[PDB]
Every structure is written in structure tokens, then in C-alpha cells.
Design a protein around this nucleic acid. Structure first.
Length: 253
RNA sequence: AAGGAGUCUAACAUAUGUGCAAGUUAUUGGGAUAUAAACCUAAUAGCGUAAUUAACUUGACUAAUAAUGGGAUUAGUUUUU
RNA sequence: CUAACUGGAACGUACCUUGAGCAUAUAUGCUGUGACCCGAAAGAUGGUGAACUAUACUUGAUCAGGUUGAAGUCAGGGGAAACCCUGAUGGAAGACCGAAACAGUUCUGACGUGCAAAUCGAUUGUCAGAAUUGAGUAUAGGGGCGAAAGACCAAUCGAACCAUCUAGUAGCUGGUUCCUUCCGAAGUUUCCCUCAGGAUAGCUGGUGCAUAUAAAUAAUCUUAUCUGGUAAAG
RNA sequence: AUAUGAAGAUCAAGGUUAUGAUAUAAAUGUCCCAGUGGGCCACUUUUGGUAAGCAGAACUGGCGCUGUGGGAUGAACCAAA
RNA sequence: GGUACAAUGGUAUGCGUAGAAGUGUUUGGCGUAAGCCUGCAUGGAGCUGCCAUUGGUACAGAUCUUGGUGGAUAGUAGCAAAUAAUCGAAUGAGAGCCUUGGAGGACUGAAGUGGAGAAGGGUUUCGUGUGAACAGUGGUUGAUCACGAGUUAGUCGGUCCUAAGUUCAAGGCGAAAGCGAAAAUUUUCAAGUAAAACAUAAUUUUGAACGAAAGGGAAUACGGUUCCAAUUCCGUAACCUG
RNA sequence: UAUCGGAAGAGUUUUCUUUUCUGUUUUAUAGCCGUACUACCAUGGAAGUCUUUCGCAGAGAGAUAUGGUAGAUGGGCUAGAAGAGCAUGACAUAUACUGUUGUGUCGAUAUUUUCUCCUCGGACCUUGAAAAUUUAUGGUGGGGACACGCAAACUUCUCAACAGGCCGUACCAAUAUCCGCAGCUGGUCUCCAAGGUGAAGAGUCUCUAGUCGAUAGAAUAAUGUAGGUAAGGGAAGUCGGC
RNA sequence: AAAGCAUUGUGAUGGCCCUAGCGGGUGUUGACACAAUGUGAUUUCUGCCCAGUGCUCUGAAUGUCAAAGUGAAGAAAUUCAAGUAAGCGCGGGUCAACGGCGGGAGUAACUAUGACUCUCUUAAGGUAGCCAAAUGCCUCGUCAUCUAAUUAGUGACGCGCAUGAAUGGAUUAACGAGAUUCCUACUGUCCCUAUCUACUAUCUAGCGAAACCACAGCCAAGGGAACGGGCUUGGAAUAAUUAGCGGGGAAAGAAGACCCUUUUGAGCUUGACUCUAAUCUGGCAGUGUAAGGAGACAUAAGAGGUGUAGAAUAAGUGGGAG
RNA sequence: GUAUCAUGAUGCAAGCUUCUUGAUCAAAGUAUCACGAGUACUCAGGUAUGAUCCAAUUCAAGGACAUUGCCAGGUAGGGAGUUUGACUGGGGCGGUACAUCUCUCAAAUAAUAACGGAGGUGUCCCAAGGCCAGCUCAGUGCGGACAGAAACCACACAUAGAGCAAAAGGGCAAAUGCUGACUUGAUCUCGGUGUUCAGUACACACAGGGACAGCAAAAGCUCGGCCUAUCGAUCCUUUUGGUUUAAAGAGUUUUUAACAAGAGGUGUCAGAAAAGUUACCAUAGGGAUAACUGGCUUGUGGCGGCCAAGCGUUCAUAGCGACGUCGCUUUUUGAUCCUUCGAUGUCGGCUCUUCCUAUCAUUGUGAAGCAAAAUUCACCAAGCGUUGGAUUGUUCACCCAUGCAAGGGAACGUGAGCUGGGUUUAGACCGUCGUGAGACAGGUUAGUUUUACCCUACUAAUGACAAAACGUUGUUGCGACAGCAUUCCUGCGUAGUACGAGAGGAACCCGCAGGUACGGACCAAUGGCACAAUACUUGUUCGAGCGAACAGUGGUAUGACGCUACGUCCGUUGGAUUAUGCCUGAA
């Protein structure tokens, strides 16, 4: 045979689950009730907090319930510049200021946004890491499909009734500090998951990896593998259009 | 010191024993009783008495009296001189 | 006319040429069954284990004494300015030395039918850390888990352990149990995925049977005849 | 062109079975019966190899399977089973 | 062809507590041989010759199997890590021990060889008695052996709460077992009432439970007491819950 | 823990030593008064800036200053406390089933080394549990209460009466109670923690406590195992200063 | 392992992975993320090659080309026939994908050497560097250094068996129970051994194993299965024992873990032979409702269709002889 | 409320929360019945409204596509199972000795082996088959213009010297060769035989019978190739063939089947369908089989003896010694496969002992082209000796040096003697190779070395009963036998002597004085070890004070006795006589 490789085991569960014990509670926008469609709803920021693992801060915002008699307590993903004690307005008639969240039709073009809904009403699925944003490229006024530009470079078409919060997200830009320290990546990852000290497959044994094995330590065959090559072979470069260093300008804009 | 390794069975072959012999073998059953034995027995069936041919067909000379017809080699026989 | 029968052959045959068989016993022999007895590395099915160890999670616990002296701060000097220079303060760092603890370098020391199926002694490594650790909890076998050695998963690991299939198979090693009498081998032939093995023929024995108060034949010489290209000869 | 060939089938006529020595009884079937299918040594002849207590063959005799006498000793030599 | 073993069918008007089988043996023999017959000694209730038919039928070997035993060897195997005991006394059958008490020299040296707990253990604790075996020497002692006893709570814990997680609940699925599912399944699947009016009327679905003698979590301390138990008994003074 | 005094005993005394030693105690619970530090409040208005820390830290968003509040953090007085009880100590009373007199007092160290309490910081692409449980506040209704006095109060106050079930609990916790086949130099989670030296929980030595348990005795050959020392030379040894 | 560096996939009806099936992990996720790999701090750089192989591309459409569907022949079975999906083939991209990176002659005033020329070829001919290296066979290379003496060390040199740039090249401070060399200090490592201590061993009293064993146990020579304790011939041969010893007993341990053989295995690899999960692709079903182009099949119908001749031009015209 | 509208038409917009970390939950109002106990009075709820109305599908994206169900193609070492020929002077590698043909081996019938030797086969052929007739070939000689070494024509000789698809062999002349003639017998059938052989198969040959045909006037006998090679089972598929047999209820046609004869193919050729690697490895065995020891063997090296071309001024052998020749030597080194695979520990070094002589040195000698010195050759000869280092794991060789002088080997001597550097398991790195797993006889680094207590042997220790040229128990002796030991160098004198033209020069013999190595003792001196004797001293402890203690010897210092070298003392003597030189003395 050979044994089940270390890529195939991460999907099975056990030691490869996410370390969600001290995480703070699933940040997402409000749900599109009636004030998010007819007018707006005022919220108050109560604290800014840190989700463990997630490098962007979160914000605890307190809305009132319009039908029940309690106080809703929403986790958001922090726009940079959001501070405690400030008001957040969510709705159709939100004014354009950070960090209001309003539908993507009530924005001008070129507006920088974060926490964008992929499909409408699904409470915040796009551009929500640390330092990242989307950009309203241009509406197509009827057919109602805004086009946005996403942090990949890629340029996607949304509808225009879904919501996004104005502003870049806070906590940017984390990734410029060197880690310097294996023990500081230990600490990075012990609140995330068991992506390891990633031992290289070329260092393993032929049982445990396609690349493992030889006397000298080499891949031995092409590292770009077919798309539907079906685990536990899909290692190396998964369906790679091209390789090598880019010597050229292929930003897609 | 005790234990410890060519067996049982199915099928066939040759050989020898035994019974009956164009036969043979009841042994699945049924009877009759005396006891898992022994006894009697119907109708079948197996094998044999007829083969050959892929098959379809066909099927072993006028011995009512010639052992295979004829020949050769032939133990024996009031044979027979 | 539609049809059947009739003539001569040759060749073939597990057939015929006036029945000899069937039932049963016993020995031998070939075959299939655990198959003379013992013996694998395997392979399948269903189970059992994370009390060791691995990793992860939850909740706890614990790590002398010193060394060194980063930013920040203070007071002085100096300079047109920019800003330098001296003292102190302070007490960072997967920093150092080392006790506990955790480890295992070297002696290739002791011991090596041991105190001990991994220990003893001395030297050494690390010691606030990607550190050590308890209980709970998760992951289970072509699976897990791995800072990766094919390591570890209960003294078991390049597929754990248990029970069954299973008396698995073995052209291979080993053993195969009373006496006397008589007869007495083979290591060659052909063929075989055959070369440590068969089947085959030869060599052996047993059991008969056909012929016992020549001119039947059969085997080494002489005779007759044919054959031969080696020694020698050239 | 011979129902003279050539084969065959019959009657005729033929002293003294037509070298030697032998007869372990020979003939013929069946169990295709068991074991065996590594051989090895020697004279003589041989091939390869520098050679070999090496490799490979022909011939007959041996050891294997065999004691005993001789070669001090010894599978095989000499003698004798 | 012959001989050993065990049986079955016949048979010997067989043998036997007046001594069968077995065993032992310088009793005497027979057989080429396997083996057989016999005397004596032990033994105490069964057994043999013949004809047939048999069978789990004969052992030196299998690094055979089970059991027992010998040398080696009463030992130049050995009982040498952790400093160390000695005097006198009593007991006793016997004393270097652990047996005791006295004196005395020493060690652990508190990061202990001191004093307590958690796992685990399960009566080992304690008193008296003690004989073999065990304590790799001894043993009058013992964690041994016999007998008798011993563990007391409103306050210490458990129990209660959840964690990581787990077991189940019919969406489901699978031939089923069961998912080495995690079901999150599921018409009102859950609450609420000094309980109502032209629906009584306001509200909520992640069901459920387990999982911490180290996390969370009400309340107690002292002095005394026993051969053996104490934040538990006794006395005293408090405290919590209802 | 250590110093120094007082009262009460003890130890040494040939010589010295107003010596050396020992003990010299006060639980939970609760009434009081105060304090370490921190925050706050009132007054008032700061540059000629000042208050302040080991450190920085703070102030026209109100410093210094003076007077108050809170946190009874963590302590002293009293109650428990019966010259209690306890402990040291002077007599008396035979097991004749018991009484008693005295003590228990001052001061002051430094514990970077223990435990707690409070403060103020730092490291971090690491930000450091959840639930029962409990309280305060706010809100609409609704509840009560009336003076010529009768009351009240699941009453967040004080006291009284009653009750508190189940199960564990002994002992060891390891050179002899557990795992390693064993009375096995192995392994196995914590708590307390004296003095002298000293930087020190080091090493060495000692007090409390504990133990002398490792078969003994004789002798001290070879070879060994562990430990020393060595003239002159100095790595010539050795694969290699092992 | 790491930090740094780079590449890859993925905007969610997604990527990756689990699952028998349902369904799940990442995911309390969202490109500064998740996942897949190589390289391995900094410094300095990272040459050329897309021929082979792998990966990749709306894209090349017709070489190949499945079932289903459609057409034809036959009484049917059925046989032929077109058009056919991915994949392949053809075309493009890509090397911090896998990997690779040449010879032969002739020439400069003594010789020597080859800046220069010609030519054969290749996808590209090994660049910057570096080197007898932990990588150089020859080999103990040659020169220097280090020593009295160096197959070692260090510095150079370079036609380099067989160096070479994220298959990373060249360096590099600090760091190291890593490998190596020299000098100092130091010593019993040595010359070259001696002695002292503890505990053994030892002797005793008590207690008491095991491994092992054909039989056993002095040799020399011979012969022998080619190295005897035993045989043959010699030499020779006296009990019972103690502590040592390590010649022998081809001593013990352990059915050689090396080699070979077995028509015995296992682990791993690869396009070995044959399969398979998953994936992609086409077809059918679930699978409906419409419009507009569809190729007007067929139908509700309609007219027109052209030899000599004759009334001419009857698509055709016979019933017909008014 | 804005364009647009004289007050309405009419599109467009809206009807309300954005200065500030407060708070909001439970309807007030009107509307409407209610107008009820009490007598004018304490004393009351519903619905609508506030909060417009009607629809209904909780909204939103997809949407007849996805997904799923079922077939089809493709991809797929992710995964499964399995296979990787034999032979073989070990296996891998090479090859094919594997099916076959000829010559030889092969020893005069036939048979006959090796990875013996020399080659051949897997085809070619409408003629190169069949048959008649005619013809003579290799070469050679004399000739014939161009024309010669050869062109062609022609004569004479030609035993095959040519030719025959033939690899070799046999064979062959009015042919089996060369040329023409017609031709299809390279046909159909049925057996039988030869070879190989088991007396099986195929296949190849043969000899016949039955046809039908070719050539020839005819006899003739043509059944492929002049002869010896040129090739292939079952199952399957596929033709030809009867003018067929069957499909099992019966006819008919298609289809299928069956039977006869071919073809399609198995080259491992009596005929599986088949790639690696394992250093992570397992099992059964094998001394039928390698790796080392032992045995035989010696081509290779060297060491000897004959002959004497010659070298050596002259001289063949003072010293050599060509071309030949005959031996010895295995250890290197091959060759071998006999013993060992239920295991003989596999290189070196260290240690330690013994043996050989193939003699380096020394003793005793003989010889030189020997004056002396130095050397060379040889003889008797194995007694003593044959060292210290640098580099390398080495082993030889080389280097520094000492040395009067620096010989060669044996028990593969020696791992329960050690060491563990080489080599050689699992870890690892580089170079080349490989697609890969992996390989390297290339480099590099790290990597458990077990047991004696048995018997001998050896070394030391005791030692009884008996037998006894004779008891017990002491004392003094004896020697058989076994062991066996000393050794080389130096310096003075000899002596600047002999010798030599000189230069150089006998450390000649002998005498003397020492040293090396080894041996056997010893301790007066000196050196080393510590009466744990004594002094001091650190820490602790004893109230202080001592020739107290503890710290497994606290540490330093001196240190008798004793042991001990690095010191001291001692270390021999006769006989037969080898090599050689002679005497006497012949045959």
C-alpha cells in the first residue's frame, strides 16, 4: 500500500479540528429585518475586543430589538477608526460614514467597503480579515448588479440589495512584522489549528508521501499534479497553470 | 518412565478367496416375528448379456450341424492303425 | 415416374467371430479427503486495546541562587542649530551560569545466568522555555499519530493484539516403533516454467501359468560371409 | 500373349539333424509392482584447463549396498565375497 | 513365516484368597531369534491356552510430548550499592539481627530515610497467641500463621455545576448490526401563571442526560479522650440550610 | 527564625564562664476602635509649573493644599479565656479511686527565601474558561397604609422552637503494603520544611524526628571494581589527549 | 523543525480533505484567509533551456471517437451507415514544474599558450561563483605552509572521473555533549612501573542456584569428510584435591539476520499484468409552462405543368359519339 | 411637495429614529354599547379605533438546470491482487550451448558430454519445380585489325580442378551442370515404414495401392526443390467441403452447431497471460551454492643447478652472464568447491610465547681484479639481537633519527585477551546512475563487542591407602631425569704503528676501563607510596578551655617500619668436534 498521508487526515477530524474554545462568538452583520430595508437602526459600540486566532479586532455593538423588549448584542468585524461609544447606523438610509453598514446600491462608485455579503441577507461573508477591503467598481443601475473588486485582485459581480460596512477593517497590516521565532509561530497557531511545524514530504518516507523516499532528497517526478487526481496523490502543485518566478506584470486590472 | 507417527473413507485396478452363473446383486422399502440381529419377499434399478457413429441412420454370413472360419504349433482321449 | 432393396472393393475400429459375468472379502497400487507424524513467513473474517507511548483538547500543578543589562526615564556637560557625549536609573531577551525537575553525551566505565528483559556510577545537555507535569477527554489497525526515525500505538510494529477460518499449504528439513528366512536395485532415456521435483522407459519383487516314476531352443568360441576408416601408413 | 512366371495349396523321394561347449530350468503374462532417476573410484582411450584430491565423456571392472585376509593406517588397491 | 499387546465370537466339564494381574530376582530352563515357561520373594481379585475375526497393536532418536531425576555442586556461582555498630541485661530450648528495654558511637540532615495525602492496594491496621512453612543467614519477632477486634460527620469529601467531550432522542441512512452518525433530530417538539376578554391570552425549538474525590460550589473550631477512630467521639464555644 | 532583658527550672563547674539550655501559649466565632494603600467628595484655582515613585505616574477633562467618605485590606483592646484550657514548674496525698501554691512578662530584628493582602507594571501576529448560584437597580401595573389609634409586617432587624437523610473514612503510600513474575538499587501526582557556613532550597556539618534494615566472622593472596599519590620527562601513548 | 523566501489552488452551488450511506472537517472560516508544496536566518546573488515528461489553456475543431438516439436493407434476429461527449492527437503557455546545460581542427618573432578563424551539431551547450571540498577515479595530484620527519591540516592552482545557482550557488557574526587539525596549559596516556585504601575474591558458619552434558577428556606423526580425545604407530600412564588461568574442547548461546535455492512470503516503487474507489464526460429518468425563430412533414386548399402532328401548346384526358 | 396645471388633470417624490455611550416592553386618548350594587350614591367591562385596505406564497436567490438514480466512455500506483523463465564451474552480468543443420570431437557399426572447436537456419523459388533433346565446365596453349593484363571470333588440350538458392559434407559429365521445347505431379486419396523415439506426437523423408494429368517416338515410374536443415498441439477464430447431419412437439427459410481438410501461434520452439526494488525485511532449506580458515593446484612473482654468446684494459666463470634448459617455492595471487550455512566470531594494531632458515649482524672460516681501510662472493652456522618517531585503520614501500650493524617468514598465531580505527545492519549527507522505490565493489559522519563456576592444558598449592630391595616417626644426604642464560657494543693502551709514493690506516691479537639489553637478588644510601603517627588549618558540634569528633582519607605538610626502581650488588665452564687449515701416507 502506503499509509494515509498527512493531507488526507486533516479532513477526518480529530487532532486537526479548530481550537475554538476561547474564541469570542462568530462575527457577522445583523439580519435583514425591516429596519435594514426600510430605514436604519442605530447601534452603540460598547467594547472593541480581540478574537483569539482572528487577527482583526471585533466590536461589540448593542442594538435594541424592534419587536422584543431586550437588547441585542452584535459582534461585528471592526472598521478601522471605530471606537467605543460611537454610533453605528445599519439600514437602507444609512449615511455614508465609517462604519455604517448599508446596501451596496446606496454607495457611490469607488467606495471602499468591508464585511460584504456574498448573497443577500447572509450576514457578512467577504473582505473581513485584517487590513482588507472591497471597492465598489460600478453599478449597472437596472438589472441591479453592482460589480465589486475583491482583495484577490479578482472582480466579482454582487447584487445591489446586499449590505457591506464602509471602511477598511482594523488591525492592518499584521503581516509585515517578521515572526523571527519558531516559538512565536507556535503561539500564532495554538489558537488556530494543527497546521504544524510542517515537515516536508520530501523528508518523509515513500509510504507517507508521494515525494518521500529517495537516497538523495528530491521530488523525483513533476510536482504539478492534475486537478482530478484524487487524494492521497493531490500533493505538490494542485492543477498549476504555470510555475517558476513571475518575471512580469500580471496584476489583473 | 509413560505417550508418540502409513489410518479411515469414496472410487477404480490387478490378484486371490467364496457363492451363484446368462446371469447376478434382498439391503431403498415391505413383510414375518424372538430383537439395531436373523428370516421372507414384490416391483424396480445397477452392472452384464451389442456394438458403432459427430450425428442421422444402422447393427454382427445361408453352424437347425463348424469356439474365431481356415492354417500352423499343438498336453490329453476305450481314441485309431 | 415418386420411392425402398440389391453388386464389387479398400481402409479404419476400445466392435464381432456362440456368452462370463455379477455380488462379496482380503492384500496391493493410483487418486481425492488433515491423508504417515511434526513444522512455516503468509492470507481472510469478526473483535480488543491510547494503564505504555504519540498528538490534540479541557482543567490543574510546579521550576534555588546568581550573571548580564535592551527600550523608557532623570541629571549633567558641549554645540548657532541639527543633535551629540558622560553618569545614573530601569530591568527587557525562545540571553547566560547553575539547584530542583526533565533529559541521555562520553567513559564505547560498572553490571552483562543483573538490583534491572535498559539498570548503576561518574561526566555531560537544558533549566522561565516551541519548558515539565497530573487527572479528564479525543484519535484504533491497511487505521491512528508523528518538529519524520518507518518512529510510536501496553517488554509486540515496514501493518498491534486476540479468537476463528485452520490439523491453511510445503517439489523442503526431521522422525517414523518386533524377529528370522528368501530375492535384490537405481543414479540412465525421453519429456515437462522442468534443473532439491515428477511422469516415462529401464533396473526389482511378488504372483502365476504353458511346457517332471529331441531335430525344444537359447547364449561366449570355430567356420562362411558382409560391414568399418581408428591405430599404423602417406 | 505362359491360367512354365511369382507366391500359395497338395501328393511324391530323401541313412546318421548337419561346428564346439553349456543348460544357472528356460517360455510367457499380469501387479506397469516397490525403490531409483545427486552418484563416485580405477586401468585404457579422451576433451577442456598452466595445473588440480579440477571439469567433461567412451569401455569394462569396482565402492555405494560388504564383512573378512594383505597394503602400519585407509570407500575403491591386491586376494577373496 | 514367526513372535509381543488389547479386544470380540467360540472353545478348554481351563486356573484363582490353599493367593489372580503386576513387580522384584545369582531359581532352573527352552527357543537361531522376537519371546516363553518355571521357582522363590512381595502383592491382594481377577486372569490365561486354543480356533476365528480384529484393532487407537510393538519405540532410542522427532532441538518429540508430559513428568521425574543425575552430575555440575553443599561448592573459586553466589548471598559485597545506600558509612556502623559495640557493651551489658532480661526473655528463651536456642539470640548479632527483626525481640525488647538501657547505655553508647554513628547516619538520613531536612529538596529527609521526618510528618501527611492523591492514584493504586484491600485488612496489610491493632491487641493477644504462635508451630511448620515464608522473611534467599538466624528469628523468641513479623506486612507470616491462629484468634479477637477496629473505620462514627448537617460543617471534611462525595453527592450539586458545567468544561473538553459523551451517551441516547427520528431528519435521516444502512440488508441489518448499527452508524469507530452526532444525530441537533422532531405536528403544538420549550416556558409562563394572587392565571383573563369578538383566540382564554402575552413569550420561547440547540431536544435530553452524563462527564472534575485538583476547576466552580452553603456552614467549625479548640481542648480532651483510644490497644485500635477522629475538623466525625467527649466537653466547650460557634455556624449554615430549611 | 534570631537578639536583648525579667520570672521558673535544667545542664557544665579542677579551672573558667552575671554562663549554656528549655519552655515563657491563646482557635473558630464575634463586638469595638484604629491603618497599609487606593479611589472618591467638598473648598479652591496652579507657569517662576508643581505633587510624586525603587520605577513612572499624575493635573485647567481641575494639581498642591486643608477637611471629609469608602474599602474595618491585612492588625491591636474586649468577649470566648472559668488566675480557663494548655504547657513549664514548687510541694502534698500509698492502688488507699486526689486536692494545691505559683508562673505564663517586656522590648526590638530581618525574613528577596515562606504564605497571604494590597499596589503598580511588563511580554504577546499568544490577550489568558463556562454554568448552577447570588445581588443591586430600573420599569409598568398591582399590592399595603387610614389616628384621636388599633396596628403591623414571605418582615433584607433581634431572638426562640425543631430538623439535617445516603455513601467513603482503618492502614500503607513504598529500599517491605502500589506496578515491574519477588520484601526487585527500577518506576509512580502533591503538602509542610530548623540551625551554622554561605550568593544560595548548593555542598559540608548539626537540632526536631527517624534509623542502624541491607548473611555474618576471620584474613587482607592474585585478578578485579571504586578511590589516591608518584622522581625525571611531558602525549614520545593512542585511530584519536580516550 | 524554524524564521525568512517563493510557487500553487480557491470569491463559496468554492478549494482541500473525510464518509458505506446519510452526511461532515477546515468553519465561531472568507484572500493580511484557508489549503497544497519546495527552499531554509541575515548578506550577496538566483545564468541559459519548454526538445523529452508533467501541468495548463473560452481555447484547434474533425484525425480519432462510447452508449443512447436517428436512417437504410431484411420475414425478423440483426448486419451495415451517417452524425457524434470528454479524453487523446494537433496548437499555445509555463522550469523558485520534473530535469538538462557539446565536440574537432588550425593559428602570436625561442619554445610554450591560444585573445582570433573555420566547422560539426543542441531545447539550451554549465553563466556568476566555487573546488582535489563531507563532492576528484587517477592520487599520498602539483606548489606553498605547518614538522626533525605529515597518505593528515590550512592557503592556493584547476580541460572539474562525476561542481554549480530556491534540484539553491557563494559566504557568514553569534550558537553547538557535531566532524577535523595545530599550538599552549596540564597530567601515570606513555617511558615503566610502584604503592596506599575500600569492597570483593579468599577461609569459615548458615543458606543455596543455573547454563551446559553421545561417551568422555595427555600428546606427536600418519591416514581419514582434506585440522582426532577415541583409529593406527609411537611417546608414555598413580589417588583425592585447593586457588588461579583463558591454549584448547573447530566451548556455550541462537533450525546463519550474509550468499544461493523454493514455480514460499511481505514492505515499497513504477504505466509490469489485470482491476478499483473517487473524479470528469455523454445519455435516460424525475421533468414541468411558455414564447420567438423552426427545417411548412403532414394536413384545410388552390391554380398553373408544353416532341414531326392536329383546332393550336390535350400536365394528363378516358368514359364519350352530343 | 416640484415641472405640468384655471381649482383640477397629470407624471415625479415622499408620508418618521443622525448634534451626544440616557431611557423605551405592560395604550393613553377618543369611538361604542355598557347607564349595573347603592339611591341619588363607593361604584364597570368589552369591541372598534389609535395601528388604512385587499390579496397570500415566510422571504431571498437559483430553477427544469444542479443534485440524485441507472448505463456509457475517459482518467486513475490514491488503493487492491498478482507476476517478474530456465540454463549457468556461486548468483547478477554476458550469452543461448533452449527448437534445429553440417564438419569435428568420437576412441574404424550405430550411440556418446562440456558456456569444447568451425560454421549455418527461421528464408528463397512459375523456375531455382516436372521432363525430353541438344550441349560441356575450371582453367591452359597457339592464334585473329582497332583490341592491351583482360572485350570478341575460332582451333587444340582439358577427371570435373567448374557449376548446382545450398552452411559444411557427400554426390553428379551424351548429368543433377549450360541452353532451348512443351509444361503444373508444388495434384487427389488411403494406409504403411524410416528418423527422433517412450519405439509417443508433430514434422521431415521414404516405399506402395487407387485415381487423374505432364513430358517423351517410346521405355520411362514426375506425389516439389540432387541428398542431409528451412518449423508448430488442445481451446478459439476462420475458409473450403459435402450438394450434408442435428437444435429432442412438427414443418419452412435465416441463424447457430457438428463433422472432413487447411490457415491464424505459441522461437522458453511438446506450446503460462506477466516489471522493478528491500540496507526495514520474513520463512522453509542448502555446505547440492558463494564470502574467510583448512586441503589440492600454480599459470604470476621470486630462489637455486647445467650449457657458455659474451661482459670484465688484457682474462668465458674474481665478480658476472644472453638464447635455451631442468627443478624448488603458494605465502601474495588466481583456479578449485572437498569439510563447515540447527553459525569454526570476519582486517589491523596492542600483548605474549614458541619455531623455521631462504644468514642482515656477530663467532669460526675459504675467496677476490684482498696493500691498509672499506667492501664483495661463498662455507659451517639459527646461540644472542634485529629499535624510537611523523603521516595513514592499514598491510608493504617511503620519511626523520639512533644505531658496530637495522634479515626474511611460520601456528589466516593470538576478539569468553583487549581495542574497535578499516570493513559491514538499521540514522544521515554529497557525487554519478535510476522515471521511481532504490544502487555504488565511490566518499563522509554516528552507531550494545555477552558467558568459564566444567574437562584438559598451564601455573602455583597440598598430598592418603597400598606397592613396597619391606614398621613407625624424625634428621642429614644422593642423582636419574626434566629445565637450562647471559649478551652484543664502546673508549684508552696497542698505534699514527704494521701497510702504503702519499692520502689514509689496522680501538689489530692481547691487556685495561665502562655501557646496552636481559637475568637473579637486594634495601645501607637516594628516589616513589603513607604509622589516616604528628603539626597546622576550613566548616560544624561538644557553655568555654584539650595530644575531641564528623566531612566514607576534610585538606595541606613532614613522615619511621615495610614494600619498592628511577638505585645498588652479582652474572660461568670443560669435552667430542662442524666449516677449514695440515701432518703422516698410499692405491
Amino acid at each position: 500500500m502506503g499509509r494515509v498521508i498527512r493531507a488526507q487526515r486533516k479532513g477526518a477530524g480529530s487532532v486537526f479540528k479548530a481550537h475554538v474554545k476561547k474564541r469570542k462568538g462568530a462575527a457577522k452583520l445583523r439580519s435583514l429585518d425591516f429596519a435594514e430595508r426600510s430605514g436604519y437602526i442605530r447601534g452603540v459600540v460598547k467594547d472593541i475586543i480581540h478574537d483569539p486566532g482572528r487577527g482583526a479586532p471585533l466590536a461589540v455593538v448593542h442594538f435594541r430589538d424592534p419587536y422584543r423588549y431586550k437588547i441585542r448584542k452584535e459582534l461585528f468585524i471592526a472598521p478601522e477608526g471605530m471606537h467605543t461609544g460611537q454610533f453605528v447606523y445599519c439600514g437602507r438610509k444609512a449615511t455614508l460614514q465609517i462604519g455604517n453598514v448599508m446596501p451596496l446600491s446606496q454607495m457611490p462608485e469607488g467606495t471602499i467597503i468591508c464585511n460584504l455579503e456574498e448573497k443577500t441577507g447572509d450576514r457578512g461573508r467577504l473582505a473581513r480579515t485584517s487590513g482588507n477591503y472591497a471597492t465598489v467598481i460600478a453599478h449597472n443601475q437596472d438589472t441591479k448588479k453592482t460589480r465589486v473588486k475583491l482583495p484577490s485582485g479578482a472582480k466579482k459581480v454582487v447584487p445591489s440589495a446586499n449590505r457591506a460596512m464602509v471602511g477598511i477593517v482594523a488591525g492592518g497590516g499584521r503581516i509585515d512584522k517578521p515572526i523571527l521565532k519558531a516559538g512565536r509561530a507556535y503561539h500564532k497557531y495554538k489558537v488556530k489549528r494543527n497546521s504544524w511545524p510542517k515537515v516536508r514530504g520530501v523528508a518523509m518516507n515513500p509510504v507517507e508521501h508521494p515525494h518521500g523516499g529517495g537516497n538523495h532528497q528530491h521530488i523525483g517526478k513533476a510536482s504539478t499534479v492534475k486537478r482530478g487526481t484524487s487524494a492521497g496523490r493531490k500533493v505538490g502543485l494542485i492543477a498549476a497553470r504555470r510555475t517558476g518566478r513571475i518575471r512580469g506584470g500580471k496584476g489583473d486590472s
